């Protein structure tokens, strides 16, 4: 019995996907190919890992990888859980690596999935803004996310989504002064700052 420290079993499966992906005009005919392989539920978790990466090597964001996922997320609910779980793996573990450029490609990539509801938006619950726990790269990830997530919806429609999503750690209204002075500080810098108009009352009352 032989342990394998080689990834040769895996590397063969990064090719197969990446080549299916670098053929294929448009994204709907590269979503035909993947769904035509009938990948096992074991790997379907880690096929999304490849698609996100091949998105980051691409030097700019594209609508290909968006619609490739959109056609795929609606196919079967097993791929619902593959993107939902890989938005957590990125934000927590895998943001620590990325250059300030590849955060601009991720931000727009989870922008189209959230703003069209494919994600949905309660999967953004993990985002927590504190001085204590945040990666500076983690901050840049959100900055690019809302710049995208505002553009489509328009910041008036965005409030309608944020108000229904009961985001706690991200929009704390309950106390902890510095945190609300922080969250407010953050969204003024991004250039939206209207989402804080509600929270700007809670400071002055507590102040």
């Amino acid at each position: 019995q032989i342990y394998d420290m080689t990834s040769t079993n895996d590397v063969e499966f990064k090719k197969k996907i990446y080549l299916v992906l670098k053929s294929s005009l448009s994204g709907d005919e590269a979503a035909h190919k993947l769904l035509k392989l009938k990948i096992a539920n074991n790997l379907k978790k880690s096929v999304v890992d490849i698609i996100i990466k091949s998105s980051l090597q691409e030097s700019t964001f594209s609508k290909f990888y968006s619609i490739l996922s959109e056609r795929m997320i609606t196919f079967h609910r097993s791929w619902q859980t593959a993107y939902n779980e890989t938005f957590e793996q990125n934000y927590t573990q895998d943001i620590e690596d990325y250059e300030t450029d590849q955060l601009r490609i991720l931000g727009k990539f989870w922008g189209h999935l959230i703003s069209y509801e494919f994600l949905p938006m309660d999967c953004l619950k993990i985002i927590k803004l504190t001085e204590e726990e945040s990666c500076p790269q983690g901050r840049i990830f959100i900055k690019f996310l809302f710049q995208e997530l505002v553009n489509e919806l328009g910041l008036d429609e965005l409030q309608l989504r944020l108000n229904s999503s009961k985001l706690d750690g991200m929009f704390p209204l309950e106390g902890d002064a510095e945190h609300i002075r922080y969250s407010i500080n953050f969204f003024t810098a991004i250039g939206l700052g209207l989402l804080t108009e509600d929270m700007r009352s809670r400071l002055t009352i507590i102040q």
Binding site: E99, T100, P136, Q137, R139, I140, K143, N185, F186, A189
Partner: protein, 74 residues
């Protein structure tokens, strides 16, 4: 990298010699080694004109490594 992040960051918004010898202030002419003129420099170019001619050769040699392949044909 570090620069980029510490920059592309909202939080930042909220807030000279190798051996400690005095260093100049205003922008100096560029140089092969990037050394910075001493605090005492008057600020006039004084040069034979070589240091600029080395760049022209430096750029040339660095260019014809690219031009050689790209102009290749068959």
């Amino acid at each position: 990298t570090a620069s980029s992040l510490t920059i592309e960051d909202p939080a930042i918004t909220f807030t000279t010699s190798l051996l400690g010898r005095k260093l100049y202030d205003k922008p100096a002419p560029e140089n092969r080694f990037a050394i910075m003129p001493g605090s005492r420099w008057d600020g006039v170019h004084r040069s034979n004109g070589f240091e600029e001619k080395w760049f022209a050769k430096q750029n040339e040699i660095n260019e014809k490594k690219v031009q050689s392949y790209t102009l290749q044909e068959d």
